[PDB]
């Protein structure tokens, strides 16, 4: 059982969660509560069927995307902020978030990813992803690369996958059919050919994953690599001059990035939700709750109007933006964690050569989109 007079937040591991601690050391000072701020591994995992015994943390932060989910299975504590606090975040902020007619978490801020390049070997980006193939035979003969992203995860993947019109679910007006899959149409296919391409004659490796990406980038061996705003603090201390700028197109398309929404949604099993709103409300989306955390890890463009004013002058944060407004905002139906866990195999399974693009994203529509729902609403 949960511990009364006491806060325990959960967050991931990219995220700034020591900034998360100052703003939770602060509201021990005036509240005498004790925030304890964890970052276990697989957090969106272990969550719902930790949540659903025995449950474990009073807040949880991840992206808007998965919270329909946990909503709908009952883990999530109904909110309830007035109209004046409302007011002080976006409503497009609030739109997202946002499930059955109700409100069941509070967002933090927006992300999206971006094209992050080393400026000092690669002043002039490319616009597009069919430059990209060239310009790594050109940086080869250096001795380095021209881009590594993580490909073990498809939301780095799906701003190009979706650049030619590939979508998960498609809308009608305010609503999604889980019947309408765009994941194996010519967008979605001529999308992820293209990225396999790149993998067949050696511009990028398949087992690249977070990790080496990132240490790669930072230590200057690549020219460019994909990611949002937390991974911005890591680059700063390494010295590398970066820039940050708009994805690269396909077929004339822009990519089309998933944006998301860093959200926090309060434990229905909680005895402490006064103090789990009085913590969110009133001491994290403030101007100096946001810098604590910001200051840690970048968050991006934020909910709170006030201090995304001051954060609107950085140029990274115009580059997400920008982006962003070319993406779409993820859905937050129950059915995107099935989503998610289906591209993720069928993505892999191409990249490995285990299937062929047409055979994975034609079984992934087909068969593995259904199974993975079956799976989840059983138990497994
Ligand atoms: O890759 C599938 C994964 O995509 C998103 O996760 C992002 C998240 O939005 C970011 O805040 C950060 O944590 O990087 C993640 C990529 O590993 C979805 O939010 C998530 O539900 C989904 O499984």
């Known amino acids: 059982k949960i511990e009364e007079g006491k806060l325990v937040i959960w967050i991931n591991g990219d995220k700034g969660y020591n900034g998360l601690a100052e703003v939770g050391k602060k509201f021990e000072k005036d509240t005498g509560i004790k925030v304890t701020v964890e970052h276990p591994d697989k957090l969106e995992e272990?969550?719902?069927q930790v949540?659903?015994?025995?449950?474990?943390?009073?807040?949880?932060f991840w992206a808007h995307d998965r919270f329909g989910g946990y909503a709908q299975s009952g883990l999530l504590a109904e909110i309830t902020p007035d109209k004046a606090f409302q007011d002080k975040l976006y409503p497009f902020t609030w739109d997202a978030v946002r499930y059955n007619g109700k409100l069941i978490a509070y967002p933090?801020?927006?992300?999206?990813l971006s094209l992050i390049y080393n400026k000092d070997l690669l002043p002039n980006p490319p616009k597009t992803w069919e430059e990209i193939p060239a310009l790594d035979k050109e940086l080869k003969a250096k001795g380095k690369s021209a881009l590594?992203?993580?490909?073990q995860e498809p939301y780095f993947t799906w701003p190009l996958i979706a650049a030619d019109g590939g979508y998960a679910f498609k809308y009608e007006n305010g609503k999604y059919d889980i019947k309408d899959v765009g994941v194996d149409n010519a967008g979605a296919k001529a999308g992820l050919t293209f990225l396999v391409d790149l993998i067949k004659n050696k511009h990028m490796n398949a087992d690249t994953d977070y990790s080496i990406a990132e240490a790669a980038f930072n230590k200057g061996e690549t020219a460019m690599t994909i990611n949002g705003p937390w991974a911005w603090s890591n680059i700063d201390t390494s010295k590398v001059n970066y820039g940050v700028t708009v994805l690269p197109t396909f077929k004339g398309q822009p990519s089309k990035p998933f944006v998301g929404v860093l959200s926090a949604g309060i434990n229905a099993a909680s005895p402490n939700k006064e103090l789990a709103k009085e913590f969110l409300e009133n001491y994290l989306l403030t101007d100096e709750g946001l810098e604590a955390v910001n200051k840690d890890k970048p968050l991006g463009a934020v909910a709170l109007k006030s201090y995304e004013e001051e954060?609107?002058?950085?140029?990274?944060?115009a580059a997400t933006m920008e982006?962003?407004?070319?993406?779409?905002?993820?859905?937050?139906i129950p059915q995107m964690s099935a989503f998610?866990?289906?591209?993720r195999t069928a993505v892999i399974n191409a990249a490995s050569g285990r299937q062929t693009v047409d055979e994975a994203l034609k079984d992934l529509k087909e068969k593995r989109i259904t199974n993975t729902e079956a799976a989840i609403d059983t138990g497994k």
Do not use: C, H, S
Request: proline share 9%; glycine share 6%; hydrophobic share 50%.
């Open 311 to 317: 954060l609107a002058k950085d140029p990274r944060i």
């Open 46 to 48: 272990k969550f719902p």
């Open 51 to 60: 949540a659903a015994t025995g449950d474990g943390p009073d807040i949880i």
């Open 340 to 343: 998610w866990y289906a591209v």
């Open 108 to 112: 933090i801020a927006v992300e999206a």
């Open 148 to 151: 590594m992203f993580n490909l």
């Open 323 to 332: 982006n962003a407004q070319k993406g779409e905002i993820m859905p937050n």
